[PDB]
Design a protein around this ligand. Sequence first.
Ligand code: HEM
Ligand code: HEM
Ligand SMILES: CN(C)c1cccc(CNCc2ccc3ccc(N)nc3c2)c1
Ligand SMILES: CN(C)c1cccc(CNCc2ccc3ccc(N)nc3c2)c1
Ligand SMILES: C[C@H](O)[C@H](O)[C@H]1CNc2nc(N)[nH]c(=O)c2N1
Ligand SMILES: C[C@H](O)[C@H](O)[C@H]1CNc2nc(N)[nH]c(=O)c2N1
Ligand SMILES: [Zn+2]
Lengths: 409, 413
Amino acid sequence: RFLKVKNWETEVVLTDTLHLKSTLETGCTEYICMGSIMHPSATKDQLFPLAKEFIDQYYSSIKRFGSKAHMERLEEVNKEIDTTSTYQLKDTELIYGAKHAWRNASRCVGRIQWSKLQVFDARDCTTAHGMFNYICNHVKYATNKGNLRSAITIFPQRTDGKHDFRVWNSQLIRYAGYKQPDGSTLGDPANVQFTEICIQQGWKPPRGRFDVLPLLLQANGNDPELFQIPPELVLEVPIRHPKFEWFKDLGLKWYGLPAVSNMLLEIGGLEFSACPFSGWYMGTEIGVRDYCDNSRYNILEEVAKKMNLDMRKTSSLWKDQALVEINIAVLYSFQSDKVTIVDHHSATESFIKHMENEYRCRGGCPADWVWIVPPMSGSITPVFHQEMLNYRLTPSFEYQPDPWNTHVW
Amino acid sequence: CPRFLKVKNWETEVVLTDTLHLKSTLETGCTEYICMGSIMHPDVATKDQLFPLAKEFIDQYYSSIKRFGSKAHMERLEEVNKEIDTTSTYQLKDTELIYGAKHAWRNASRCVGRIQWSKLQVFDARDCTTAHGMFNYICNHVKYATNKGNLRSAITIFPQRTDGKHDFRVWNSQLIRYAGYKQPDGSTLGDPANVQFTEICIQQGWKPPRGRFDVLPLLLQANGNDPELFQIPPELVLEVPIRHPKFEWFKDLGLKWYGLPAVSNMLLEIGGLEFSACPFSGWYMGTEIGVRDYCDNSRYNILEEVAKKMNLDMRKTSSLWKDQALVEINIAVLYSFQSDKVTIVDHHSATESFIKHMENEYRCRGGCPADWVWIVPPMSGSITPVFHQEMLNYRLTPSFEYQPDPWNTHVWK
Ligand code: HEM
Ligand code: HEM
Ligand SMILES: CN(C)c1cccc(CNCc2ccc3ccc(N)nc3c2)c1
Ligand SMILES: CN(C)c1cccc(CNCc2ccc3ccc(N)nc3c2)c1
Ligand SMILES: C[C@H](O)[C@H](O)[C@H]1CNc2nc(N)[nH]c(=O)c2N1
Ligand SMILES: C[C@H](O)[C@H](O)[C@H]1CNc2nc(N)[nH]c(=O)c2N1
Ligand SMILES: [Zn+2]
């Protein structure tokens, strides 16, 4: 069942064989496509086949399939599940698994970097203070004074679901959001809820536009605890425009390190509920989504006024104009501060090249066109014209529910 | 399949509930293990295949006019059945034809303009027998729809397929398009998208002006005969010269586009009947011209030339010089059309209308199939409301379908 994907601009056709190695669902059926749905719908006996699957591909990946080492590992993992209802990955396997979860992440346009990932093993962590220490080291390592380095820190795997390690923040670094008396919103409205949970727990908010949230860390199923990231570890960039000297007066800033902390890493049937990972920003993430989404910072109107645009009718495309200038400013600011960032043209171009490598060496590359195509200037990037196949490979990063919906104190 | 599927809008938190997907009649191409949502494209029906297909449609029609189960309903069923049994096909009443065409549009998941679905002038050309007659019908379509700039959506429907060796076909992908010419040096003049078709017209006897914006002749096939060339009267072809409200130099690019987008190569399927020639037209969303026609690399590819005249730094991609030029080009397209009083809609207005449309459809029909990949405009996606709208895609009938290009299948006489 070979499948072709065509690029309609280059006329290049690639052939997908890798999709046959999928066992998990996408949500679509033969009659309904859920391609634009954000979130479409263990035990001993469940655990061994999954473990065996993963061990098999690991030893296949290192070109020693059926080897002496392979056979022993299967036997070892088998006995361990049998006696403990779970098992422990070797260090090599942990690293392999984390890199391959990134490699398999269909929504990520940054996967050309997949094999360059610093993996921090934190599976010996037992307390929230421990988690905080590991997270601080992660932030300091990955930030690297502006020359950002991809990293992931991995906390103890789930056991019975009652003793989960969770990073309650959705990212290690985010700005707080405050509901104002007049019903408006101060700061980042995405984090309004979380921000209030921090307030409720003892955090004293400066009530500003860009207040770095505290860490809320839960170890071994216990109540979460508050920690302030040492500010010298938090790299931030003042946004300015290279032509418009009034732009700095907007008072905008963003942090340099995007560090997603609320996903679940699944490897060989094992679940890692706390696995903050980080790379670096594509400019549009901040410039289009964080800044210009109606339900986020929502600055288009303000910027539009400073550029003195006619805002009476949509067909003047004043929004599109303002959107481009904002995104120029973000790239300029980060570059001028020697902080790693990628523009959407460069990123999408690297992704097409990555796709080509993957088809050539791996027989395909799962990819989610809905997420891959940038949220501005879509068809002037090469991925718009790229047919992609989406399918779920393991190891993977999965969504999990917010901890405050399932945690009793 | 579950009876209630929910879609969420991530900007407004509005949740809608779809039940209409249960009426889905054909395959998307996806399976449970793979999604083909970004794939562009993922001899006749026997008596027994035709019976349920026809009954399905007739039931739907009589349900729509609140006469389901009526004597007229059962009579129509019995008459259709007899007709299939004695002729292996059947003929649609004018009322059913009009309903079916409007519903094929209503069902078109890739169309952002469907709020207008129930306002569609249908021209019944099922009495057409020759290519000259097809030409007459098409000229009348163009003039009515153009309406001196005040465009009116319309479809003209030619006779349905019979044995498959007598198809009516418009060979043109749209009624109005510009020629493309491959040069000996590898460069292209005009629209690179139309090179192949242009070549065919030239072989058929067309004398090409060999310019940048040469309107192509119609290449019309009636009753399965070899196709024939016809020139559309130029006074019927409304065109807009592109200028920019600020940049005086923009008119010097010698750009223009035609006013009427009129897809002419799709197949219209109603109650199992196949109308292989059904040119239809609405009006343009600006980005269709300003982003795709003008800025695609494989199309007119003008970004560079515009950026140069704007004197942009074009060395660092991170200057976003492409993005900056793209916006100006789209501003010029909208300004030129509005100035010449030719109907056009910007992508903000269109997508906002589609959201209101989609909500109404979920309310009154239990759903609205939509293809997010197509519905989200090719620029500024995130700042239009559709980007944030979860959509369910599925294929309802009647529908517009793709069909192979006629020169690939035609048996030359
Ligand atoms: C190194 C530079 C990287 C770049 C430029 C990059 C780029 C992106 C972008 C732009 C998105 C879309 C996010 C959004 O729109 O909200 C994304 C998604 C994603 N990325 Fe990457 N990424 C990078 C590194 C990484 C790393 C190191 C990992 C994991 C180890 C990773 C895993 C993921 C996952 C799982 C998603 C899906 C997020 C979701 O479903 O919410 N990425 N990436
Ligand atoms: C009245 C104003 C209309 C507007 C603003 C509009 C808008 C659009 C746009 C922007 C597209 C995407 C085209 C592309 O990117 O190639 C599209 C596709 C489509 N439209 Fe509409 N449309 C209109 C009228 C109509 C009518 C009258 C019909 C049929 C009766 C129709 C049926 C379709 C179909 C079948 C597609 C899919 C085209 C394909 O798959 O190539 N539209 N429409
Ligand atoms: C609920 N959830 C999983 C969540 C939480 C925060 C943000 C998001 C959206 N995904 C954003 C994201 C993820 C990974 C990235 C890696 C690199 C990069 N530059 N940006 C990323 C953005 C979802
Ligand atoms: C079937 N095929 C290959 C084909 C032929 C011509 C054009 C296209 C792309 N679809 C363009 C289209 C379709 C309907 C429209 C309705 C209104 C409008 N303003 N634009 C439309 C563009 C594909
Ligand atoms: C409804 C739709 O799935 C949702 O808005 C998606 C669309 N594409 C996206 N693409 C990226 N990269 N990030 C996102 O958050 C989204 N949101
Ligand atoms: C690969 C991808 O499916 C292809 O480029 C699509 C994307 N979405 C589109 N959307 C519209 N409206 N028109 C198009 O031609 C396309 N092309
Ligand atoms: Zn799908």
